[PDB]
Every structure is written in structure tokens, then in C-alpha cells.
Amino acid sequence: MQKGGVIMDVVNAEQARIAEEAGAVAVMALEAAGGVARMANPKIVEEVMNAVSIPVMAKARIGHITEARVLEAMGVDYIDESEVLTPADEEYHLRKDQFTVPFVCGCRNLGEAARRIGEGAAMLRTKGEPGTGNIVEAVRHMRQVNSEVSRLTVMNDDEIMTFAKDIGAPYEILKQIKDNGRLPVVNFAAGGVATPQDAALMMELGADGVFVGSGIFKSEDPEKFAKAIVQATTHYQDYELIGRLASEL
Amino acid sequence: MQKGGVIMDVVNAEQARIAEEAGAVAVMALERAGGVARMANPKIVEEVMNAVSIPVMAKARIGHITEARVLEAMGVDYIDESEVLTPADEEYHLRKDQFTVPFVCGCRNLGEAARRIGEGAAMLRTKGEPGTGNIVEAVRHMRQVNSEVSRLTVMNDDEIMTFAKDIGAPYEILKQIKDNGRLPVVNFAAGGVATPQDAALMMELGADGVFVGSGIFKSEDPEKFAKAIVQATTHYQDYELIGRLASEL
Amino acid sequence: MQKGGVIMDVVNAEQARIAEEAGAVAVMALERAGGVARMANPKIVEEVMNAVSIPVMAKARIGHITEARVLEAMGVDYIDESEVLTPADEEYHLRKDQFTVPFVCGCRNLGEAARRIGEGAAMLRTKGEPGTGNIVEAVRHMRQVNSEVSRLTVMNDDEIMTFAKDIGAPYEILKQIKDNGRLPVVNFAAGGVATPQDAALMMELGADGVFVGSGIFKSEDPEKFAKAIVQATTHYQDYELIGRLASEL
Amino acid sequence: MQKGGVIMDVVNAEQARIAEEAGAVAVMALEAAGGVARMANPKIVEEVMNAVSIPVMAKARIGHITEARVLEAMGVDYIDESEVLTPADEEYHLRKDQFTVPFVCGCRNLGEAARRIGEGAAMLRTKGEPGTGNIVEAVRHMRQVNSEVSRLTVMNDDEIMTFAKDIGAPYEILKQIKDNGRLPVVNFAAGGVATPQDAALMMELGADGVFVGSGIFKSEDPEKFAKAIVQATTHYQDYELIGRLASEL
Amino acid sequence: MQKGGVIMDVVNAEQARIAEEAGAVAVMALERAGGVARMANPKIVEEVMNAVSIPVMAKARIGHITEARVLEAMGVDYIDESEVLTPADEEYHLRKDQFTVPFVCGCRNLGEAARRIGEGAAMLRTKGEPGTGNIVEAVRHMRQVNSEVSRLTVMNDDEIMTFAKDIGAPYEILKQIKDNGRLPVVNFAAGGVATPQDAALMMELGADGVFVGSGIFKSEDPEKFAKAIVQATTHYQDYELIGRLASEL
Ligand SMILES: [Cl-]
Ligand SMILES: [Cl-]
């Protein structure tokens, strides 16, 4: 879809323009801790869409059918059934396959990833620890999903079903993963990316892109931090450029 | 009995008038950690009744026979044996069949629903989490009741009795539910409805109506907010109209 | 329905004739650690029916619809869904209301009694400890049912529902028991009756009749023993006659 | 496949001929308690196949690839990955989809049934308690599978995935069951069928046929018992004929 | 090192000759609740060596340095530090790298396999359940080792050390296994092989050979049975030939 890029969380049109100028592959509209966290007001989403030409994403509460249907009616590119917001259903997720708009979901293991894909998700990402600035949770989630997938690619067929039963995964999804040799969708790194070295590390661990952001607007030079993150996600093994960019922050 | 409507909590005559002008099917008279919560003063109920022509409802403490009989003598349309008030009897509910006025009660599963119906309740609603603005508990209760009813409609006869024994439901009530194919009374959504998307979501889950709290008057434009809630409860699948209405809140 | 009588377990035509001559109100056809206990062969039931003019009863495994339907097609008077046989369904009993022949079931408390009645049982009896000769369990079950019924007859209405919820009884059945002032069906004593004093004691506790096992034919004079059991079940307070009859055993 | 019939376990050519004369839809070749229970000698299977024209089945140890491949090379119609035999793999079942011969497996719940179907089973049956003559286990397994399937046919889509996760079932199998309205394969009753009334009961509970046998050869008139079981499996609601046939055993 | 062969347990010269005539790649000298199991008498080992030209193996107690050194001085080809004998050291195994003769050891997982290899073992085999005739434990051990090796071959480098730390394996041994892509020594199947189908199944699971116990001589035709075992271990996918050979046993 949009592999190799950086996704930023914007709060107005100015931050969206700064993101487009920095080289972000997509934007995420959002309005922070306390109370109930619901979807953003449609005016903010419409402003974010009118501000940039890059695809704009919006978050919806888990299991909230109406929020996702409203974001779909608005013409949003992708919808993020985000656990960042206060969930709406603590038992059942959205049946994203019944939707026209593609969906991105969070996961921490191959079981969660397979359950989200079977529910109709088009894109995946790590849950991480959003708002903490700590990359350890995203690292753990990425490494767990990748190790389980590597096991599944070289697992004996006779042992696949049991494996699913042990991790709560749909059998057909695991068979598809084994036949294709990798995840059928892209898996991004989200929650915890604070420095461009964090984005480079997540891309070195085998991520298909960086999803976290929001904090880039808090720096003394927000545009500089955004450009540094975007340039560190791409060509993540050029350490000299990474150090040079980090020196100017 | 008047399914598909919106019921609002009012505290004075002005709120009752505003709710009537918004298009609410009925009103609920209320007074206000909060100490002991009892029934409202009869003067406030009389004011609410004289303010609007729509049916007026009043809350009574659980198991408080005298409060309910007084509200019946006052001429209220429906009485809510509401757990939101400090209960008066923590072991037995009132014998609603021995009353002349209809009753609405809260429930979280088919067992509680059947226990309330067997006692003579004329209406049901989810308990939810009142005052929290989170529709999680209402969603959970509605889904649980709907799932147990779906079980009961297509269940073998030999397995009905034990089912009642396992859920504390009256046997004849469960047999009637199986024979009719649905609940004998309407089931509304209550506690947690914060946005028009929440009302549309509760109606999408199969509710027969929504109960709005006092937060509807907390908006900058309470009249517009109440109108949006009403217009979203009706035609709950028109997601474009829901998004348009929410853009103005 | 024929209250105050004695029911005897017979295995052939001679035993049925001897029980008829003793004055038993009905007979029970039987075949025999004992492996699996199923219904008796239809030939033995037909022999028992052709041997005596009194009503003949046959036992069926719990939840075994086919055994009960076969016994109904054979023309049996009553069917005993007896736990003394190896049960066929350990979760659900047969829907006795959907049958044409009346049923007698075992019970140890008002909850089991009400569950059996709600399923359509026409008669009740204590489970006891069959084959032990000890009337302890029959006494216990009879006293428990009588105590719970005495509670229910003089209990407040508001406390009925919870009571059902606490004992697994159908609400309408408990309401009917409260309104009528007694059990809707007769309750017999079964399992443990060894001496005529045991039958007189079960009748003193408020039973509507006694079920005699196979030990009645184990005496040196089986006819005299059966006659003593019958003469003690009737006029159970004539202690001098009971002692006289027991002196000859 | 072969719905409505009775399957018998034969040990030689004479019992297979008696089964074919009785009206069995298929035969099961077998050679009993103690030690290790493996597949039968190929000579016995070849004799059973040469004795009758009805399809012949053979049992293989669970997870034993070579035993099933040998039975497939022999030209056996169906293979029974039977838990009756001492298992060969206590973790992983055979991938029956990779086979040409159709497979029949045992199950006790919708989870096991879905795991067996996803593994490539063409036919199902209850595990029961083989060799005990007690129908209670088959009754429990049949009722559990049927109740879970009835739930699944009327379950909300948004709740399906979670349901699978709760029972360890493949998501696609459950979706297929919901879309078709029933199990995609036939579900037979096995283990415990001792009397023709047991077969009639299993068919009244919603089974697609009777699978248990073996014991029919132990009666005084084995041919008579076999004919009675075959006639009771078909037209299971003719209770008069069932009683007549049972009277002659 | 001589992969794909069959190793047989012999007790005299006649058994060694019969095993050689059957086509076994090597022989195992043995003597016999059974008290204490020690190494065999040197006279029996010398007899077995003089009887056949194939390589002869002898078992030694675990950690018994002197037994192994004596067997080395006797001129044995391979030594089996077999747990089937009563161990002499329950804490430490012998330093096989300090010996001149090659060693074969038992294992149940990659941890035990790596611990044995690091100590200098030249060959591996499953522990199984010797004397039971049940291939369950051999299947389990083989599948566990194969699964852990499949994990290790496609595992990230950063995750290797911890993996060793979590399984008690030497780090350099695991690195060598990852670099070579397979085990550094052959892994045989042992303990539980009862039928030629069992040998074919162990070879299908990826074993490098089978260890036959003493039951091969318990058949009515021991020579035919041993020939069938050998002919099934080789070309283990020719299921028609396996069935034909088994038909004669
Ligand atoms: Cl917070
Ligand atoms: Cl045994």
C-alpha cells in the first residue's frame, strides 16, 4: 500500500502542510489523557483532507460501527480501529470486511494479527505504548510477530492447526501466511517512536513503515524533526546521515 | 409500545419544553458521590407533567413500594425502578404486576430481564454506566441479552428448563420468549449514550430506543444537540446525515 | 390421584398376583454394582399387565425419549423417569408435558420438585437410598420438601421471585403452590422403606403413599410382610396394630 | 454420503455377510481392552472387502500417517481416525485434506468438529464411551454439538470471530456453518448404542445415522439384533414397531 | 554417517546373524521392574562382534566413565550412553569428546540434543518409551526436535542467545545449527517402534533411521518381521509395499 514511508498525526491544517512538506506518506487526523476518547469531530477531518493531497487517516473506537461508517461516508482513505481511543466494545471488533474503506489495526502477536486480518483488516501496526516516548513496547510487538511468522513459514503442515488453536488464530489465515511466506498485509511500527534513531531501528527490525508521530510538533523546530524522521525511515542504514540529522535537534 | 423513540432526563419545565421541541417521545423527571438518591419531589414531577404533553416518567428506588404507589397516585405515565437511585431493598424488587401503572426496569442479561418481566415489568432497558459517557456497558448488556435471546429462539425444548435453572429465569417466561421469537417487551438502551453516533450504534445493535441522560443540556447548543440525538436515533443507518449533524456539535 | 396407597416392585406374574392379593394400589415392573440399568423388556411389562388389574408402572432412563415413547405405546399406566436406572441424559429431563401418559419423578427439595412439575410431571416421590433399607434419605427429602412448602405458603409475595432464583424453581409454579396452599401433585415416599414402621413413619411425615422395593419378597413370609406394609401405610397412627403386625415378621 | 443408515463393526466375513443381510449401509473392519491398539491386519480388511459389496471402513491411529496411507492404498472407502485405538500423536491430527480417501473423525463439541473439518474430515461422529453400552456420552456429545451449531446459525456476525477464539475453531469453518445453516458434513452417533431404542433416540436427537455396533454379534440371535437396530435407525418414530422388535430380544 | 539404516538389539550370535541376514546396518548387544541395569558382559559383546561383520554397538550407564572406557578398549564401534540402563550419574554425563569412540545419546528436545552434542556426542536418537510398543513418545521427541530446529534455522541472530538461555543449549552449538541449516549429527528414532508402519512413520517425520528393540524376535516369524522392518524403513513412502509386508505378519 504505502510501504517505506512515515505517517504523522496532525491536529490542524498547518501541521498537515508541514507533514506534506516533510515527506510523509500519509496523515492521521486527531484532536491528551483523561475522560473518554472518541472519534474526532468531522470538521477536523474535513479540514485535514482539504489541507493536503496525501491520504488522510482517522481513528475510530474499537467495535464502534457507527463511527467507522461515518468515517467511511466522509471519504476517508483508511480507518484506524485504534485502541488509543477509549474502546466501544470490549468483546468484539468491527467486521472490516463488510466495509469499503480499508482498515488498519493494532497487534502484539501473530494471534492478534491473524484475528484482525480474518476480521477484514488491510493493514497492521504495533500497539506500542502511545504517548510514552518509549520504543520498547513496539520493539517487543514487532519482534514477537516477526518471530512467530518466521516459525510459521517453516512449520510442518501437520502442526499448523494445533498452532492456531494455541494462539487463537484462524486456520486459513495461518495457511495463507505459510503459503505466501510472509504476512499478507503490511505491518507498521507505532507507539513510542520519539527519535529518528527509533524509526531507523523499527525499520531495521523488519517494519514496513513508521506509523507513530504527533510528538514531532513539540520540538523547537517541528519541521526539522519531521524531516529527520522521514529521512531516517527511508534508507535506515545510512548511519552518518542519521547522526548528522540528530545533531541538529 | 412506542418503539424507536428517545427519552430524555429533564429537571425543570424549560428542559421539558426543549426536549419536546427537539422531538423526544417521553421525558424523565429528575432532581440531581452524592449521598442518598431518592425519588424526586412531587412538585417537580407535576411541573414536568404540566410543561409537556409527551408521556412523563419518574424514577423510584428499587423495592420501594411506597414511592412507586405515590408516583402512581400522582398520575405518572411510567415508573422506572431505577438502580441509579440508592436502592431501598437489596434483595427483592417490587411486584410490578400488582400495580396499575407500567414499569421499566434495568437488566444486563436474559436472566435479569426475565426476572423483571416475570415480576410484571412492562419495559426493559440496559443498566449501562450512567454519568460516564461511555457506551461500553450498554453495548455489553444489549449484546448479551440479544445473544441469549438468539440462543433461546432456536434452542431445543428439552434444554429450556435447565437453561432457566442456569440463568435464574422463569420457565414459562422463557417458553413464551421461544414461542414468540422475541422479547415480550421492548428493550431500550440506557447509560453511556454521549454522541449521536452512540445512539445510532445502540439502534444498530437492535435496541428499541435510547435513554439520554443530563449531558444533552451540557453542550454549547443543547437544543441542537438534542435534535441531533433524536435525528440519529431515527434512521440510524444514514451515516452521512449523522456525520453532518455531528459536524455542528 | 389415588393418594394413600402402596406401590410395589414386581418382577413376574406371581409377584404381581401376590401384590394384588396383599392390597397394593399399583405395581412396578422390573428386571433386576450392576453395570448399565435400562428399561425392562416389553414382554415382562406385558406379563405384569396381564397378571393384575391394578395400574402397572414401568421405569425409564432419565432423558430417554425413546424408552418413554415405547412404554407409552405399550399401554403402561404411569412411567417413572427413575434415577435408579443408569441415566441416558445427565443434563436434561424429558418433556413430560409433551406426552400423553402421566409421569412420576424423584426429588430431594422444592427446587427439584418444581423443576419436575414444570416439565410436566404428574407425580412426585422421594429419591431416598434404594436398596439400602435405610429410610434416612427418604425422611430427609420429605422433610426438606415439606419445610420449603411450608415456607412458600406463608411467604410474602415480594420474596417469591428471589426464592425461585435461589432454588432454581419456576416462578409461576411457586406462585401456584403459594395460591393453592400445597403441592399440585401428590408426593410419595420411596427408597429405604424396610419395615411397616418405616411406612407408618413416612406417612406420619406427610407423604401421600409409599413405594416398596424388592425386599418385601425377601421375607420368610412375603405375603404376610406385604400385607403388613399395606395395613401399616393405611391407618398409620394405629401403633398397637403396627406392633402386632410387626411381631409376626 | 450415507445418511439415515446403520454402520456395524465386523470381525470376519460371516459377520459382514450378516450385516449386509440385516441392511447396514456400511461395515467397519476390526480385530477388547489391554496393551496397544493399532490398525487391523490388512488381511482382515481385504477379507471384509471381498465378503460384501457395501462400503467397508477401517480405523487408523490418530496422527499415524503411514497407517492411513496404507488403508488408502488398500482401496478402503473411508478411514476412521479413531480415538478407540491407542493414539500415535497426542498433539497433531492427520491432515486429511492431503488424502484421496474420505475421513471420519470423532468429536464432542463444535470446537472439535470445526478443528476436524478444517483438517479435512468428510464425516463426523460422537466419541461416546465405546464398549460401555451406555448412551449417555453420545447423548451429551450430540446435544453439545447441536446446541452450539444452533447458536452459530443465529449468531451476530460481529461476534463470530470471538466465538471461534473461545472454542478454538477455524473462523472460516464457522462462517461456512452459519452461511449454510447446518454442519457441512454428516454427524453420526457412535459409542454406547446397545439397544435399538438407543439408536432411535440418537436419531431423534438429530443424528444423521448410527455408527456404533460390534455388540450385535454377542446376542443370542445376532442377526435379529442387527435387523432390529437397522429397522430402528430408519423411521425412528414408529414406536410400536420398536417395541415389537425389542420384545423378541 | 550411515543414515537411513536400521539398528537391532541382539542378545546372542544367532540373533546377530539373523539381523545381518535381514539387512540391518548395525547391531546392539544386550543381556536382558528389573533391578539394576548395567553394561553387558564383555563375552557377549565379543560374541556379537565375532558373529557379524556389521558395526556392533554396546550400551553403557549414563556418566559411567569406566564402563565406556572398557567398551572402548574392547573395540566396540559405537557406544550408547543409554538411559534405558540404570544411570550411574544423575547430574553429569560423560565427556564424550575426550573419548576416541563415537557416541550416540538420547534426547527429547533441542536443549537435550544440544547439551549432548556439546559434550561430544556423534549421534542422537529419541528416548521414546522402550518396551511399550507405543511410538507416541518417539513421535513427540522427533517432532519437538524438528520444530525447534525449524525455529532456529529461520530465527534472527539477536534472538539466538536468549533462546539458548531459555533452552539450556550451548550458544556456539545453536549458532552452528543455524549456519548449517540442520543438525550436525544424524537423529534416529528409538523406543516404541512396533510395526513396519511405525518405522515408515518415524522416517516420514524426518528421522535418519530406526532403532528396533527386542520385540522383533517375538514374532512367529522373526526373520520375516525383521526383513519387513528393514524394507519399510527404506522407501518409507511405498505404502502398497508396506501393506503387503504387514499382511504377512
Ligand atoms: Cl489519563
Ligand atoms: Cl484395558
Numbering used by the authors:
A (entry chain B), D (entry chain B): 17 to 47, 55 to 272
B (entry chain A), C (entry chain A), E (entry chain A): 17 to 48, 56 to 272
Task: Pull verbatim passages from the article behind this deposition.
Crystals of SaPdx1 were obtained, and a dataset was recorded at the MANACA beamline at the Brazilian Sirius light source. The structure was solved by molecular replacement with an AF2 model and refined to 3.0 Å resolution. The dodecamer forms a cylindrical quaternary structure with an opening diameter of approximately 52 Å and a lateral height of approximately 84 Å. Each monomer is folded as a slightly distorted eight-stranded TIM-barrel with the top of the barrel pointing toward the internal aperture of the cylindrical quaternary structure. The experimental electron density allowed the modeling of residues 17 to 272 out of the 297 residues of the enzyme, with a missing region including seven residues in the ‹2′ region. Two electron densities were identified in the P2 phosphate binding site, and the densities were modeled as phosphate molecules interacting with R138 and R139 from the LGEAxRRI sequence motif. Additionally, an ethylene glycol (EDO) molecule was observed to bind to the active site of SaPdx1 close to the catalytic lysine. For one of the monomers in the asymmetric unit (chain B), a hydrogen bond was clearly formed between K82 and the ethylene glycol molecule.
Pdx2 has glutaminase activity, converting L-glutamine into L-glutamate and an ammonia molecule. The latter is delivered to Pdx1, which synthesizes PLP using ammonia, ribose 5-phosphate (R5P), and glyceraldehyde 3-phosphate (G3P).
